[PDB]
C-alpha cells in the first residue's frame, strides 16, 4: 500500500521545508562537483603528455643543451602549479556544501520523527478498548519502535544521497557530451549492462542483515514452541523426536541457503566480468580512435571516466528507493493508526461533568454482543437497578453476561440497544474521563506497573501527597507488609523488581482505586485466582472499600457474597431471579444450585570450532591470496597504457602494443571471474556447514540443561530463540569471511608498496603520510552509505521500557485514567535522545565533509610534488601515475573491502556466549544413559524430609523437612496456603530440580541413582495449562510416549479414555484435524483432556495431576473430571489439589505450610480434626 508520497511529509510544519529545499540544493551542487574534477584531470594529464612528448622528441641538443629543456620543464612547472588552485577551490566548495547537505537533511529527519513518535503514542493510548483484544498486543508492542525506526532510516538521509546521485549522473552525462561526442554513444550502448551490474551488485552489497531470517522461519517456529513448552517436553522425554524434527527443518533450510549463496556469488562474479570487458573494449575503441589523430588523451580519459562514474552513481541508488517505498508501507500502517477516529473518547471534552453523584445505577433493555462475533448475543433485554450506596452481586452461568456488566459501566463498549444510566442521566452523555474517574475497578488478575510502589499509587492520581498514600494503603490493609519490605515505599516492583504475592498485588490495586475516591465500585472476579487465606484479608479490605459506595461485583464463589444486599442470577444475558440470599436459596433456582454445590575472545578456540573441514579453508585461502595481489595488476597495466600514450615511436608497434594490453584486460577479467566464484563458494559453504553444526549442537545442549536455567529472567523464550538465531548468525562471520578480506588487503597493499618502491623512490615517502586519512575516508563513506553507524539504540531502549510496560498492561491503566502521566513520562526519556541526535548530526556532517575535503586536497598536493619530481629529469610520468594509482586505489580498495564483512566485537562476544553454553555441563544429565532402570513396575513413592530452595532465589525457603509416602494405586492430595510448596513435589519427582538435603525414593530406590529418562518415562504429568503443539491430534497425543511405532489402533483408545473420542468424531476431518493457530480452536477443558490422553498412551504407573483454579467451562469441566477420575483408578497418583470436590474422595490428604506437613489423613478424619483442612471446606459454605 501507499500513503501516498504527498501525505508522507504531512507533519512537516513551519521551517523544516526550508531545510528540505536548502538540502536538496546542496545535494545538487554537491553531486555536480565530481565530474568536473575529472575534466581538470584530463586537462592536466594532457599537459604532462604534451610536455613529455616534446622533450622526448629532441634530445641531441649539443652543445649548450641544458637550458632550453629546463625552460620546457619550467613551462611544465608553472602550467602545472596553476591547477592546484582549482583543485583546492573545489575542495573548499565541496567541504561546505557536503556539510550543509548532510546536516540539514538529518536535522529535518530528527525534527519530524520527534513529533510523529509522540503523536503515535498519543494515538495508541487514546483508543477504543474494543479495538484491543483483537490486534494482539504482542505485535503492537514491537510495531511502534521497529516501524518508526524503519521510517526514520527511510525518510531522512537516504533521499539526499538519491538526489546527489541523480545530480552526479546528469553532470557526468552532460560533461560527457560537452567534451566528447562519439564515445559517449558507445559507452551508453554498453551502459545498461554495467548499470545492472553495479545496481544489483550494490543491492547485494547492502545486507545481509536479516534476509537469512526469511527462509529460516519454520525451524524458528518449532524452536519457539518447544522452548515455550519445555515443561511438558522434559516431563515426557521427547528430546530425540523434537530434535529430529528440528533437524529436518534445519537440513532443508541449509540446502536452500547453499543454493542462494551460490547464486549470489555467480551474480557478483558476472558483474566483475562485465565491468572488465567494458574497460577492455572501451580502451580498444579509444586507442583505435586516437591513433588516427581524432581526439587527444585528455578527452578520452575525461569522457570515459565521466560516463563510467555516471553509471556507477546510477547503480548506487536502488537501495535508497527500495528503503523509501518500504518506509511508505510502514507509513501506511502508522498513519492508518493515527488518522483513526475513536468514537468513545474517553479523552474528548464534550459530555457533562455532574458533581455530587449519588450513585443510582440503571441498565434498561440492554442488548450487547462483543465486536469479535456480532452473530452471537451475550446480553439480550437486560434490565437492572442499583440504589445509591447499595451492594448488588451478579452470579449465574459463566460466560453468560456478567463481566459485560463491568465492561459496560466503564463504557468500555457501547451497548447496541438499550440505555445505561447513572442518576437518571444516560452514560453516553457524560464526559468519559470524569466517568472513569468517579469509578474504581478491581480486576480479576491484579497488575502492577514496573515502577516504585509510590508511582503505582499516584497512578491512581498524579497529584497525591505521601500522607494520602499512607492513608490509602492503611485502608487497603497493605501497610504492615510494605513496612517489612527492604525499601519501604521506594521498593521497586513489577516485572523488574521483587516478586510479590497475589494478595499483596490485589491490595495495592485496591489502594490505587481508593485514593481516586470513587462514588461507584466495580469488582470483576476480584478473588478467583487467590487462595483461601489470601482471600480473607482482601475481603476485609473490600468491605472497608464498599462502605458508602454503590457497588456491583462480578465474581464466582458465592460464599462471603452472602452478606450482600441483593443478588441477581443471570441466564442467557437475562436476570431470571433477584432478591436476598435467603430468598434465592428459598427460590431454589440458579443461585441455590451453585451455593449447594459448594456448601573474553579466545581466538584459537573460535578457529578450532571448525577443525572438521580444513581443506575448504586451505583452497579458499590460497585463492584469496591470488585475489589479493591481482588488484595492483590492473593498476600497473593501466599505468603502462597511459604511459605508452606519452612517448614517441613507430606507430605500428604502438598499435600492436595497445592491442596486447587490451586483450590482457580481458584475460584478467576472466581470471578474476573464476577465482572470485570458487573463493566465495568455498567460504560460503564452510560458513553454512559451521552454522548448521553449531546451531544443531547448541539446540542439543539447550535441551540437555535442566529446569533451573529457565527461570533467570535473562533466559526467556524470545531471549533464547534470539540467542541461538542471532548468535549463530554472528559467529558464522568471525571465522567465515575475515581471513579472506584480511589476506586480500595485505596482499593488495603490500604488492602496491613493493611495486612502488621498485620504480619510484621519492613520492612514496610522501604518500605514506597520505594513506591513513583516505583509509578513514573509505570506511566512513561506507558507514554513511550503509547507515550502520546510525543504529546504536541505547537510551531509546532505556526509554521503551515504559512504552512496553504501559501498552501490555492496558486495561488497568485505561480504567485508572492515566494518559497524561504516561505521555508526560514518555516526553523526557525521549527528549534526551533528541539533543543527542542533534549533536550526532552536526559531528557526523563535519566528519564526512572533512574527509572528502582531505581527499580532494591531497590529490592536488600529490600531483604537484609529482610535477616537481618529473621536472629535474629523474622520474618518468609512468612512475608517478603508477605509484599514485597503487597507493590511492589500494586505500580505496581497503575501504571498500574492510567494511563489507561483519564487525568484531559482537562476533567475538557471541562466540563467548556460544562456547560458554556449549561447555556448560548439566548437573542432572538427561542425555546420560546410565542409571539402574529396573524391571520393577510397582510404584511406591516416598519423600523423606526434602530440603529445597529455588536456585533462582536461594534466599527464600520453599520446602524444609517435607516427608510423605504414596502407596501403589491410591491418591495423595497436597493442599496448603500460598508459598507452601505443593507444586514443587511434581517438579521434584520429575527431577526438574534436586533437593539440597533429604531424599526422594521410587520403589525404595533413590531417584538420583535411576536413569532420568526412565524415571520421567514412568511419570504422567498433567500440567495446569496444557500446552499443545502446532500439529495434528495424533501427533500431539503420540508426543507423550516417545520412540514407538504407534499405529492407528493405539490412538483411538487413549482418545476414548480421555473423553474426547465423541467430540472428535464430529469435528471436521476427525483425528487428522490440524490444531494450532491455523486450525480449529479448542476450549481449555478439551485441551486438558488431550493432555490426559497424551499421558495415557505412555501407560505410566504414576500419575501427577497439577490442576487448580479456576473453572468457567460449566460443561467441559465435568468431562475433564470424568477423564481424570478414569485415569486414577489403577495408578499411583499425586494430586495438587485446589478444588474441594476432588479431594474428599482421595485416600490420603496432606496439608502443607512453610514446607512442613501440619496434618494428614482422610477426608473424614481431617474434617473431624477441625484444624487447617476443616477451615478450607468451611469457606465454600
Amino acid at each position: 500500500p501507499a500513503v501516498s508520497v504527498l501525505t508522507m511529509f504531512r507533519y512537516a510544519g513551519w521551517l523544516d521545508r526550508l531545510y528540505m529545499l536548502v538540502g536538496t540544493l546542496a545535494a545538487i551542487i554537491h553531486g555536480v562537483a565530481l565530474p568536473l574534477m575529472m575534466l581538470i584531470f584530463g586537462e592536466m594529464t594532457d599537459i604532462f603528455a604534451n610536455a613529455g612528448n616534446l622533450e622526448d622528441l629532441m634530445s641531441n641538443i649539443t652543445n649548450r643543451s641544458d637550458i632550453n629543456d629546463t625552460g620546457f620543464f619550467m613551462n611544465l612547472e608553472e602550467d602545472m602549479t596553476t591547477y592546484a588552485y582549482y583543485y583546492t577551490g573545489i575542495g573548499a566548495g565541496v567541504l561546505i556544501v557536503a556539510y550543509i547537505q548532510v546536516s540539514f537533511w538529518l536535522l529535518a529527519a530528527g525534527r519530524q520523527i520527534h513529533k510523529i513518535r509522540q503523536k503515535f503514542f498519543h494515538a495508541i493510548m487514546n483508543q477504543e478498548i474494543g479495538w484491543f483484544d483483537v490486534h494482539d498486543v504482542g505485535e503492537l508492542n514491537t510495531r511502534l519502535t521497529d516501524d518508526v525506526s524503519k521510517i526514520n532510516e527511510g525518510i531522512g538521509d537516504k533521499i539526499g544521497m538519491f538526489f546527489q546521485a541523480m545530480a552526479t549522473f546528469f553532470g557526468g552525462f552532460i560533461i560527457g557530451f560537452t567534451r566528447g561526442w562519439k564515445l559517449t554513444l558507445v559507452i551508453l550502448a554498453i551502459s545498461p549492462v554495467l548499470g545492472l551490474s553495479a545496481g544489483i551488485w550494490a543491492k547485494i552489497l547492502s545486507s545481509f542483515t536479516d534476509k537469512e531470517l526469511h527462509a529460516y522461519a519454520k525451524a524458528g517456529a518449532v524452536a519457539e514452541e518447544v522452548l515455550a513448552a519445555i515443561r511438558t517436553v522434559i516431563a515426557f522425554g521427547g528430546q530425540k523426536k523434537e530434535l529430529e524434527r528440528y533437524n529436518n527443518n534445519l537440513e532443508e533450510a541449509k540446502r536452500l541457503g547453499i543454493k542462494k549463496a551460490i547464486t549470489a556469488n555467480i551474480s557478483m562474479g558476472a558483474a566483475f566480468l562485465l565491468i572488465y570487458a567494458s574497460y577492455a573494449l572501451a580502451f580498444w575503441y579509444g586507442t583505435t580512435l586516437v591513433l588516427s589523430g581524432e581526439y587527444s588523451i585528455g578527452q578520452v580519459l575525461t569522457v570515459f571516466f565521466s560516463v563510467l562514474i555516471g553509471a556507477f552513481s546510477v547503480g548506487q541508488a536502488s537501495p535508497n528507493i527500495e528503503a523509501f517505498a518500504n518506509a511508505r508501507g510502514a507509513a501506511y500502517e502508522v498513519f492508518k493508526i493515527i488518522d483513526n477516529k475513536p468514537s468513545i473518547d474517553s479523552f474528548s471534552k464534550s459530555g457533562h461533568k455532574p458533581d455530587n453523584i449519588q450513585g443510582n445505577l440503571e441498565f434498561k433493555n440492554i442488548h450487547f454482543s462483543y465486536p469479535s462475533r456480532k452473530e452471537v448475543q451475550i446480553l439480550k433485554g437486560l434490565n437492572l437497578k442499583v440504589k445509591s450506596g447499595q451492594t448488588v452481586a451478579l452470579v449465574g452461568n459463566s460466560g453468560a453476561g456478567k463481566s459485560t456488566t463491568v465492561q459496560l459501566m466503564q463504557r468500555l463498549y457501547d451497548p447496541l440497544d438499550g440505555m445505561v444510566s447513572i442518576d437518571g442521566q444516560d452514560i453516553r452523555t457524560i464526559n468519559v474521563r470524569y466517568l472513569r474517574e468517579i469509578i474504581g475497578v478491581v480486576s480479576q488478575e491484579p497488575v502492577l506497573f514496573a515502577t516504585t510502589i509510590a508511582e503505582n499509587i499516584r497512578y491512581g492520581r498524579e497529584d497525591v501527597t505521601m500522607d494520602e498514600i499512607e492513608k490509602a494503603v492503611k485502608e487497603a490493609n497493605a501497610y504492615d507488609f510494605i513496612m517489612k519490605l527492604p525499601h519501604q515505599f521506594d521498593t521497586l516492583v513489577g516485572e523488574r523488581g521483587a516478586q510479590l504475592s497475589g494478595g499483596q498485588k490485589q491490595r495495592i490495586a485496591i489502594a490505587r482505586a481508593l485514593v481516586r475516591n470513587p462514588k461507584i465500585l466495580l469488582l470483576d472476579e476480584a478473588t478467583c485466582a487467590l487462595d483461601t487465606e489470601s482471600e480473607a484479608v482482601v475481603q476485609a479490605a473490600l468491605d472497608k472499600a464498599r462502605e458508602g459506595r454503590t457497588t456491583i461485583v462480578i465474581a464466582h464463589r458465592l460464599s462471603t457474597v452472602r452478606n450482600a444486599d441483593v443478588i441477581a442470577g443471570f441466564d442467557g444475558g437475562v436476570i431470571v431471579e433477584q432478591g436476598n440470599h435467603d430468598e434465592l436459596m428459598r427460590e431454589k433456582g440458579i443461585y441455590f444450585k451453585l451455593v449447594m454445590t459448594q456448601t573474553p575472545a579466545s581466538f584459537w578456540r573460535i578457529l578450532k570450532l571448525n577443525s572438521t573441514e580444513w581443506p575448504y579453508f586451505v583452497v579458499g585461502i590460497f585463492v584469496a591470496i591470488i585475489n589479493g595481489g591481482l588488484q595492483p595488476a590492473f593498476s600497473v597495466i593501466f599505468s603502462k597504457i597511459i604511459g605508452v600514450f606519452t612517448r614517441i615511436d613507430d606507430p605500428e608497434t604502438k598499435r600492436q602494443n595497445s592491442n596486447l594490453f587490451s586483450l590482457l584486460f580481458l584475460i584478467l577479467g576472466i581470471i578474476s571471474f573464476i577465482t572470485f566464484f570458487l573463493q566465495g563458494f568455498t567460504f560460503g559453504k564452510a560458513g553454512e556447514i559451521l552454522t548448521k553444526r553449531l546451531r544443531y549442537m547448541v539446540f542439543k545442549s539447550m535441551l540437555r540443561q535442566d529446569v533451573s536455567w529457565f527461570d533467570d529472567p535473562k533466559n526467556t523464550t524470545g531471549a533464547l530463540t534470539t540467542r541461538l538465531a542471532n548468535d549463530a548468525a554472528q559467529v558464522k562471520g568471525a571465522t567465515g569471511s575475515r581471513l579472506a578480506v584480511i589476506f586480500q588487503n595485505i596482499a593488495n597493499l603490500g604488492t602496491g608498496i613493493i611495486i612502488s618502491f621498485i620504480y619510484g623512490w621519492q613520492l612514496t615517502l610522501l604518500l605514506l603520510a597520505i594513506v591513513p586519512i583516505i583509509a578513514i575516508a573509505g570506511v566512513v563513506e561506507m558507514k554513511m552509505l550503509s547507515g550502520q553507524a546510525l543504529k546504536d539504540k541505547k537510551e531509546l531502549e532505556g526509554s521503551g521500557k515504559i512504552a512496553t510496560e504501559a501498552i501490555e498492561n492496558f486495561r488497568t491503566v485505561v480504567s485508572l485514567t492515566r494518559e497524561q502521566k504516561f505521555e508526560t513520562m514518555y516526553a523526557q526519556s525521549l527528549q534526551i535522545p533528541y539533543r543527542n541526535a542533534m549533536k550526532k548530526a552536526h559531528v557526523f556532517g563535519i566528519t564526512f565533509s572533512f574527509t572528502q575535503a582531505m581527499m580532494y586536497f591531497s590529490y592536488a598536493a600529490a600531483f604537484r610534488f609529482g610535477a616537481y619530481l618529473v621536472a629535474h629529469k629523474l622520474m618518468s610520468f609512468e612512475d608517478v601515475l603508477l605509484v599514485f594509482s597503487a597507493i590511492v586505489f589500494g586505500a580505496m580498495a581497503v575501504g571498500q573491502v574492510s567494511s563489507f564483512a561483519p564487525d568484531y566485537a559482537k562476533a567475538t562476544v557471541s562466540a563467548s556466549h556460544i562456547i560458554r553454553i556449549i561447555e556448560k555441563t548439566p548437573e542432572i544429565d538427561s542425555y546420560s544413559t546410565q542409571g539402574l532402570k529396573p524391571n520393577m513396575l510397582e510404584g511406591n513413592v516416598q519423600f523423606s524430609g526434602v530440603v529445597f530452595n529455588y536456585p533462582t532465589r536461594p534466599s527464600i525457603p520453599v520446602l524444609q523437612g517435607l516427608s510423605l509416602e504414596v502407596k501403589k494405586g491410591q491418591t495423595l492430595a497436597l493442599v496448603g496456603s500460598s508459598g507452601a510448596g505443593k507444586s514443587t513435589v511434581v517438579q521434584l519427582l520429575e527431577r526438574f530440580y534436586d533437593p539440597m538435603a533429604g531424599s526422594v525414593f521410587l520403589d525404595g530406590k533413590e531417584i538420583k541413582q535411576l536413569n532420568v529418562q526412565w524415571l520421567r518415562a514412568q511419570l504422567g504429568i498433567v500440567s495446569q495449562e496444557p500446552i499443545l503443539f502446532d500439529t495434528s491430534i495424533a501427533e500431539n497425543i503420540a508426543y507423550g510416549d516417545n520412540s514407538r511405532v504407534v499405529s492407528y489402533e493405539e490412538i483411538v483408545r487413549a482418545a476414548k479414555e480421555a473423553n474426547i473420542h465423541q467430540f472428535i468424531d464430529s469435528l471436521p476431518d476427525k483425528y487428522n484435524t490440524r490444531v494450532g493457530d491455523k486450525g480449529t480452536q479448542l476450549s481449555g477443558g478439551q485441551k486438558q483432556r488431550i493432555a490426559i490422553a497424551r499421558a495415557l498412551v505412555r501407560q505410566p504407573h504414576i500419575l501427577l495431576l497439577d490442576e487448580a483454579t479456576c473453572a468457567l467451562d460449566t460443561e467441559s469441566e465435568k468431562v475433564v473430571q470424568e477423564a481424570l477420575d478414569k485415569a486414577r483408578e489403577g495408578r499411583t497418583t499425586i494430586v495438587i489439589a485446589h478444588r474441594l470436590s476432588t479431594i474428599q474422595n482421595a485416600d490420603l490428604i496432606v496439608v502443607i505450610q512453610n514446607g512442613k506437613v501440619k496434618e494428614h489423613g482422610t477426608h473424614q478424619q481431617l474434617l473431624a480434626q477441625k484444624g487447617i483442612y476443616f477451615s478450607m471446606v468451611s469457606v465454600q459454605a
Partner: antibody, heavy 122, light 114 residues
Framework: EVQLQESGPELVKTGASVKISCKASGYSFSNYYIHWVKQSHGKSLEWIGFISCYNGATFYNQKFKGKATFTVDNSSSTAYMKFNSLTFEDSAVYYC???????????????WGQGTTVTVSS | QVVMTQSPLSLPVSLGDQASISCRSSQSLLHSNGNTYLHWYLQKPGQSPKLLIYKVSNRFSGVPDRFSGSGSGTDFTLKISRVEAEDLGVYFCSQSTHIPPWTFGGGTKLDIKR
C-alpha cells in the same frame, strides 16, 4: 575532407616587417605540430622551424635564430609567422605543413598549404 | 647535418611505361629498431604537394595502384608503372633523423620523350 590555406602573394619593401598566415580547416586543430618550411627559387628546401599549435612551444634552427617569430590563435584555428629584420635574401615561397604530435619523428608530413610567394624590393 | 643526393635530376619518359628514381644518403638511415624512413612526395605546379609513399614500401590511403618503392641500407628507389597523363610534376625525397636539421631532397621533373 582536410585543407590548409595561406594568404595571397606579397610585395614588401626592404627593412620592414611582414606577417604570414596558415589557416586550417577540417580536422582536430589541437593535436598537430605546425612546421614552417622555406623554398627559394632553384635550390633545396630549408627549415624555418616548428610550433606545438596547442600552447605555443617553439623551436628554431640555427640559420634563422632571431629572424622570425611564431604565434597561434586557437579561437579561429590559425597559425601566424611574424617576420622582421627583412632583407633581400628572403624572396621565396613559404610552405606550412602538418604533423601528428602523438607519434612524430617516425611519421611523414600529411598535408601542405598551397604556398605563399614573398618578394622583397627596395 | 645529413646531406643527400638524388638522381636523375631531369629524366624523360614516354606514356604508360616504367620510370625509376634513386635517392642516396650519406649517413645510415637504418634506425636502431628495424625501420628505414623515406617519404616520397609528389608536387604539381601551383597546387599543394601531396604524400605518395611513406616508409619505403607501404602506401597511403587514396593513392592509385601504379606506384612502388624499394631499397635498403643507404640507397632507395621509387618505381612508376604505367605513367598516365596526370603524374607530371616534381617528386622529392625525405629523411629520418630530426634536429639537426630534418632536411629534404632536390626534385625531379618529367619529360615526354620527343
Amino acid at each position: 575532407e582536410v585543407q590548409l590555406q595561406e594568404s595571397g602573394p606579397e610585395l614588401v619593401k626592404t627593412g620592414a616587417s611582414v606577417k604570414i598566415s596558415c589557416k586550417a580547416s577540417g580536422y582536430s586543430f589541437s593535436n598537430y605540430y605546425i612546421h614552417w618550411v622555406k623554398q627559394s627559387h632553384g635550390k633545396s628546401l630549408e627549415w624555418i622551424g616548428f610550433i606545438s599549435c596547442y600552447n605555443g612551444a617553439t623551436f628554431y634552427n640555427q640559420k634563422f635564430k632571431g629572424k622570425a617569430t611564431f604565434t597561434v590563435d586557437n579561437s579561429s584555428s590559425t597559425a601566424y609567422m611574424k617576420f622582421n629584420s627583412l632583407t633581400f635574401e628572403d624572396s621565396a615561397v613559404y610552405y606550412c605543413a602538418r604533423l601528428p604530435i602523438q607519434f612524430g619523428n617516425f611519421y611523414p608530413m600529411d598535408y601542405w598549404g598551397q604556398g605563399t610567394t614573398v618578394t622583397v624590393s627596395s | 647535418q645529413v646531406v643527400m643526393t638524388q638522381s636523375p635530376l631531369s629524366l624523360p619518359v614516354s606514356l604508360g611505361d616504367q620510370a625509376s628514381i634513386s635517392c642516396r644518403s650519406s649517413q645510415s638511415l637504418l634506425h636502431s629498431n628495424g625501420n628505414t624512413y623515406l617519404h616520397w612526395y609528389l608536387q604539381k605546379p601551383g597546387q599543394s604537394p601531396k604524400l605518395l609513399i611513406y616508409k619505403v614500401s607501404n602506401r597511403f590511403s587514396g593513392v592509385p595502384d601504379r606506384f612502388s618503392g624499394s631499397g635498403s641500407g643507404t640507397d632507395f628507389t621509387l618505381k612508376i608503372s604505367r605513367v598516365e597523363a596526370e603524374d607530371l610534376g616534381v617528386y622529392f625525397c625525405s629523411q629520418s633523423t630530426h634536429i639537426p636539421p630534418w632536411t629534404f631532397g632536390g626534385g625531379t621533373k618529367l619529360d615526354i620523350k620527343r
